[PDB]
Amino acid sequence: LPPGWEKAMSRSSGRVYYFNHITNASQWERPSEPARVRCSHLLVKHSQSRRPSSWRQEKITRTKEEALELINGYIQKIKSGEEDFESLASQFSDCSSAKARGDLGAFSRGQMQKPFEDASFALRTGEMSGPVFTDSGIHIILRTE
Ligand SMILES: Cc1[nH]c(-c2ccccc2)nc1C(=O)O
């Protein structure tokens, strides 16, 4: 299986699924290095973020756990097709890239927070991460190129 991916057992179904420990993605289907990738993200900040402030809210007070709960709700809606990623990034991301539907442009290794970068380089084009934790807060990442 590709970088980060491991086979696991579903705790509800007893069905096998696949989990990626670098991107925190999980899916039923079995899965399948560029100098550069392009990603969008949706950032949810919490009270322990390096800067507990954003365009959305002068003082961020939600807890880390309450942030993870928001992130998980947004991932469920994205995966159900109830909302799309760009639209949740625009409305709800605590990063100023929200104004570009979360798009960060192309970057190479050596530029982003390491957990952010490793998750980005382990997604294939089109794929979305699970919750990715950095000092900025909690991220959903979409690799677009
Ligand atoms: C406002 C913001 N954006 C990001 C970020 C983090 C990883 C990748 C791209 C942007 N960090 C922050 C921060 O305020 O800490």
From Swiss-Prot:
Phosphorylation at Ser-53 by DAPK1 results in inhibition of its catalytic activity, nuclear localization, and its ability to induce centrosome amplification, chromosome instability and cell transformation. Ser-53 is dephosphorylated upon IL33-stimulation of dendritic cells. Residues 34-145 form the PpiC domain. Its EC number is 5.2.1.8. PROSITE patterns: PPIC_PPIASE_1 (PS01096), PPIC_PPIASE_2 (PS50198), WW_DOMAIN_1 (PS01159), WW_DOMAIN_2 (PS50020). It catalyses: [protein]-peptidylproline (omega=180) = [protein]-peptidylproline (omega=0). The modification Phosphoserine is found at S53, S90. Expressed in immune cells in the lung (at protein level). The phosphorylated form at Ser-53 is expressed in normal breast tissue cells but not in breast cancer cells. Residues 1-32 form the WW domain. The WW domain is required for the interaction with STIL and KIF20B. Interacts with STIL. Interacts with KIF20B. Interacts with NEK6. Interacts (via WW domain) with PRKX. Interacts with BTK. Interacts (via PpiC domain) with DAPK1. Interacts with the phosphorylated form of RAF1. Interacts (via WW domain) with ATCAY; upon NGF stimulation. Interacts with PML (isoform PML-4). Interacts with BCL6. Interacts with FBXW7, disrupting FBXW7 dimerization and promoting FBXW7 autoubiquitination and degradation. Directly interacts with RBBP8/CtIP; this interaction depends upon RBBP8 phosphorylation. Peptidyl-prolyl cis/trans isomerase (PPIase) that binds to and isomerizes specific phosphorylated Ser/Thr-Pro (pSer/Thr-Pro) motifs. By inducing conformational changes in a subset of phosphorylated proteins, acts as a molecular switch in multiple cellular processes. Displays a preference for acidic residues located N-terminally to the proline bond to be isomerized. Regulates mitosis presumably by interacting with NIMA and attenuating its mitosis-promoting activity. Down-regulates kinase activity of BTK. This is Peptidyl-prolyl cis-trans isomerase NIMA-interacting 1. It comes from Homo sapiens. The lineage of its organism: Eukaryota, Metazoa, Chordata, Craniata, Vertebrata. The gene is PIN1.
